[PDB]
Enzyme design. Structure first.
Site, PDB file in Angstrom:
ATOM      1  N   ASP A   1       0.800  -1.225   0.000  1.00  0.00           N
ATOM      2  CA  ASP A   1       0.000   0.000   0.000  1.00  0.00           C
ATOM      3  C   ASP A   1       0.839   1.284   0.000  1.00  0.00           C
ATOM      4  O   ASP A   1       0.305   2.372   0.242  1.00  0.00           O
ATOM      5  CB  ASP A   1      -1.106  -0.019   1.059  1.00  0.00           C
TER       6      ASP A   1
ATOM      7  N   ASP B   1      -5.917  -1.121   3.421  1.00  0.00           N
ATOM      8  CA  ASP B   1      -4.802  -1.614   4.264  1.00  0.00           C
ATOM      9  C   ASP B   1      -4.402  -2.977   3.669  1.00  0.00           C
ATOM     10  O   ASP B   1      -5.167  -3.941   3.751  1.00  0.00           O
ATOM     11  CB  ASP B   1      -5.340  -1.873   5.663  1.00  0.00           C
ATOM     12  N   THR B   2      -3.225  -3.043   3.062  1.00  0.00           N
ATOM     13  CA  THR B   2      -2.632  -4.328   2.767  1.00  0.00           C
ATOM     14  C   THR B   2      -1.885  -4.867   4.004  1.00  0.00           C
ATOM     15  O   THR B   2      -1.453  -4.073   4.878  1.00  0.00           O
ATOM     16  CB  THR B   2      -1.639  -4.217   1.572  1.00  0.00           C
TER      17      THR B   2
ATOM     18  N   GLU C   1       1.241  -6.168   6.142  1.00  0.00           N
ATOM     19  CA  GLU C   1       2.659  -5.786   6.079  1.00  0.00           C
ATOM     20  C   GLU C   1       3.425  -6.956   5.481  1.00  0.00           C
ATOM     21  O   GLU C   1       2.903  -8.067   5.430  1.00  0.00           O
ATOM     22  CB  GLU C   1       3.195  -5.512   7.493  1.00  0.00           C
TER      23      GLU C   1
ATOM     24  N   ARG D   1       3.759  10.931   4.166  1.00  0.00           N
ATOM     25  CA  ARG D   1       3.370  10.228   2.914  1.00  0.00           C
ATOM     26  C   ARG D   1       2.197  10.932   2.251  1.00  0.00           C
ATOM     27  O   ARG D   1       1.202  11.252   2.924  1.00  0.00           O
ATOM     28  CB  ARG D   1       3.042   8.754   3.152  1.00  0.00           C
TER      29      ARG D   1
ATOM     30  N   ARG E   1       1.037   6.748   0.143  1.00  0.00           N
ATOM     31  CA  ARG E   1       0.295   5.714   0.832  1.00  0.00           C
ATOM     32  C   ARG E   1      -1.121   5.702   0.228  1.00  0.00           C
ATOM     33  O   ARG E   1      -1.781   6.766   0.090  1.00  0.00           O
ATOM     34  CB  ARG E   1       0.244   6.106   2.327  1.00  0.00           C
TER      35      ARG E   1
HETATM   36 CA   LIG Z   1      -0.270  -1.912   5.651  1.00  0.00          CA
END
Ligand SMILES: [Ca+2]
EC number: 3.1.31.1
Length: 130
Positions: free
Chosen positions: A16, A35-36, A38, A76, A30
């Site tokens: 992301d 939300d991908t 981590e 970001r 970002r």
């Molecule tokens: Ca993430």
């Protein structure tokens, strides 16, 4: 109204986050509203691979800022990212490689579109939803 602006890929970072040349200045972006996992989490490498391929193989990369705050607290840029007119944020969610994120500071324009994608990926038990 929102506007798409040109950008050049510098480096894909993870699912992301992506580094782009934007107005001749390198910036980390970002993705809004997603939300991908981590990289070190389940589906993290898959999400990283997905976003990398999409941005590296696109002929034209664009950034579209929303109507709320344009930078997060970590410096970001907060945008929707497109590759050949296809939204990376939506593509990740529809693939079940990201969940929809909380709204941050008024940036909600594509929230419903992303929620629709998410509901479909969940009905299909795809990836994160497996
Ligand atoms: Ca993430």
């Amino acid at each position: 109204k929102l506007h798409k602006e040109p950008a050049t890929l510098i480096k894909a970072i993870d699912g992301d986050t992506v580094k782009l040349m934007y107005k001749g200045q390198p910036m980390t972006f970002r993705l809004l509203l997603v939300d991908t996992p981590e990289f070190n989490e389940k589906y993290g490498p898959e999400a990283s691979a997905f976003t990398k391929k999409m941005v590296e193989n696109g002929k034209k990369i664009e950034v579209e800022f929303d109507k709320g705050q344009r930078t997060d607290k970590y410096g970001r840029g907060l945008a929707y990212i497109y590759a050949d007119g296809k939204m990376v944020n939506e593509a990740l969610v529809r693939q079940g490689l990201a969940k929809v994120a909380y709204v941050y500071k008024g940036n909600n324009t594509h929230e419903q579109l992303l929620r629709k994608a998410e509901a479909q990926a969940k009905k299909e038990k795809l990836n994160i939803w497996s």
